[PDB]
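Input:
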Amino acid sequence: QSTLRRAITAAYRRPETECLPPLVEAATQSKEIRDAAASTARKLIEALRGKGEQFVTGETIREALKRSKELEEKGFSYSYDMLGEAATTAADAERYYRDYESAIHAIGKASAGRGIYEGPGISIKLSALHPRYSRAQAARVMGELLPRVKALALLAKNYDIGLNIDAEEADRLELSLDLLEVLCLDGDLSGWNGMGFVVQAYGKRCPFVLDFIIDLARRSGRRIMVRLVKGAYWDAEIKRAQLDGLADFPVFTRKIHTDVSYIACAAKLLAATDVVFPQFATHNAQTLAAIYHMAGKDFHVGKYEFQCLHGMGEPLYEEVVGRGKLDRPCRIYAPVGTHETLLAYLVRRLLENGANSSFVHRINDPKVSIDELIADPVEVV
Amino acid sequence: RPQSTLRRAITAAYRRPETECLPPLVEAATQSKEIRDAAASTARKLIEALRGKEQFVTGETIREALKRSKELEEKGFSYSYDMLGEAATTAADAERYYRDYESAIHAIGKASAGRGIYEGPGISIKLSALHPRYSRAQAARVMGELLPRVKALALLAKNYDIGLNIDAEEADRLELSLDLLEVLCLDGDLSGWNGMGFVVQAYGKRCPFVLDFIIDLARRSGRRIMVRLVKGAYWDAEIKRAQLDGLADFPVFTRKIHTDVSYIACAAKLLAATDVVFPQFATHNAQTLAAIYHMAGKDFHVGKYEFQCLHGMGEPLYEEVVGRGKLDRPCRIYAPVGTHETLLAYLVRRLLENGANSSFVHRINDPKVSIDELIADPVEVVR
Ligand SMILES: Cc1cc2c(cc1C)N(CCC=O)c1c([nH]c(=O)[nH]c1=O)N2C[C@H](O)[C@H](O)[C@H](O)COP(=O)(O)OP(=O)(O)OC[C@H]1O[C@@H](n2cnc3c(N)ncnc32)[C@H](O)[C@@H]1O
Ligand SMILES: Cc1cc2c(cc1C)N(CCC=O)c1c([nH]c(=O)[nH]c1=O)N2C[C@H](O)[C@H](O)[C@H](O)COP(=O)(O)OP(=O)(O)OC[C@H]1O[C@@H](n2cnc3c(N)ncnc32)[C@H](O)[C@@H]1O
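Output:
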């Protein structure tokens, strides 16, 4: 318990109208940056509007590694996702653990010393590693989970690759955050900056989680890799919240509020690149353009990166990566597994790609003008 | 208590152990070796035809959907229209869905133009669209407000002589929906109309006992109830809910081939009661289809039974079924009508259907699945 931790817990269900004013202020950019970002966004969208096997990079990590070489020389990197989540039995959790373990050895050998920014990494889900992750007591879940995650982190340290903890349901944020803190203070993992953590901008706690993580990085000496996403579980969080009879939800209910929150949280991360490695995971060209200009003219590999999903982000990020474009790197989140393990991920991709509010749907909607696509969320909210 | 024995048998099955549910289903689903050989031949033909050849919505409005239906109706298909909408969260939403169904019935009834409930189009409704807290509110309140709304829609359907089907949703809603079916079937204001329909899900342990109740209800009500037999659209959600609820035994089967056996056993029950029910075999699985086609025997007339399929999924299969030169059996297409603002939840149920490794529509495209396996009789696997 700390002042920074208390700020997180107090924001859990803070009323939506009270969360927004500080995010709007932090998300407000100068006219000069807004004009530049509108110009860049227009160019990206005009290029775009000239453009489940699609979502899986390979059935095995050996296959996925072989298929990554082409895009790696173009300037992309990878984070591999061994598909599987919500273990319901001990045997399932054990299988998922072994898949992560064998993936780290293969990825680490493939990395061949390229390090955590130039070379590939791995993403894991805590719900794959504990048989009753959502339905068991937090103190117990962390107690059996910690040895398994630390063991994987130690393997990632051995090869100097990134290891990212994906973000799942809102009611498991606090548990996963406690695990991150223990790992960052663990002396056995010293000198390795590959530990990564996802934060979801549709959550009311997002800016306070970031404050805690930025301070944790600074006092632990770990340059925590922070993947900023908007959030993949919105419809499930709304349904759970309505069932709980709550007046105030843990997530925003208007898409524009999530967009403002993302920009505000990006500004927070870009002000802290000394101690964290921001990873801006988005397929929205307006979001990308805003962050590109917010980051300033100074750039080096390891300052920050963008990220996208395999099979979704390549049309946009082909206009970003490389010296003929914006010369900024992008890490591709690469699912690996069978069609069976793919289903839950696929469903989330459908809720993303099929929603009228999604950038990837609007970009192909003849009713949606380019002027609307480059609107600054602060000016519209 | 009225129908005590039949009602007690439904309750007893609700969470009966899976191993105990199966032996009676396996026996009733066992067919002779000759029929199995003939069904294997038909299924092989259908799959060889299949493997040798927004997608889910028929139109944004009922007018557009009705216009788009003419081509397949000319071929021998019929339609059941689904105004996309379910799980109303506000009383205003329920009233909106009611008015959507009401106006659709007028439009479908005009288009039917007196063709009747078997040759002409009908409508499908979801009770969760018509009550704002359908899953959460006490049965007394849900029944007392829902029953006048569904009766009013049924009266309009009667006035145009079209079918009106109550879709099946989550397992904990079965009891209420069945009580409503009974009250409507005994309501004299609906006399002379056989268009009331009801879905039963074969992945549920209660399915054969629900069918017993429905067949007896048809006998005592004088209504020929339309019964759509489906396997079930909510499997992943039912498993998750039962886990959360702390149940030791689930209300649905957990082995996919058990659902297949349940379906064939229940088809056998329905096919022996066609005097008082109209069976509607909703499936995209060519092996299931072939099994029922041969189970039903050589005598057929339109109105005895029909097959059904979902728009954008089943037409390639049933193009090999409808029509004199094929199997000469009718198929009713379930036709969603709406926009993105109501389409996602149906898409998700369709993706969970289409994306699952155990689904026929996935296996037909799987290179590791032989035609031998696709035509295998699931009853032999469990016998
Ligand atoms: C690119 C990427 C995304 C995600 C992850 C990694 C990478 C590289 N990551 C791993 C995969 C898990 O699914 C991850 C994600 N989400 C999550 O909760 N935890 C994780 O560990 N990833 C998905 C990500 O959150 C997001 O859903 C997509 O990238 C789409 O976002 P994007 O910025 O591309 O698109 P926009 O269309 O501008 O926004 C879509 C998002 O907006 C939110 N939304 C939609 N309606 C809303 C209403 N009515 N109120 C509030 N918020 C709303 C949603 O978050 C929606 O996804
Ligand atoms: C054709 C059709 C289908 C459905 C409906 C109408 C019509 C005309 N109807 C309305 C649409 C609602 O979503 C309806 C359906 N389902 C339902 O519960 N209530 C309804 O009112 N419809 C869908 C239908 O149930 C079904 O899901 C599909 O047709 C697919 O089944 P089909 O016979 O085509 O294909 P198979 O692939 O042989 O079987 C798939 C089914 O098997 C079950 N399953 C999957 N995993 C299982 C495990 N592990 N154990 C047990 N059973 C399992 C599921 O039922 C799965 O759908």
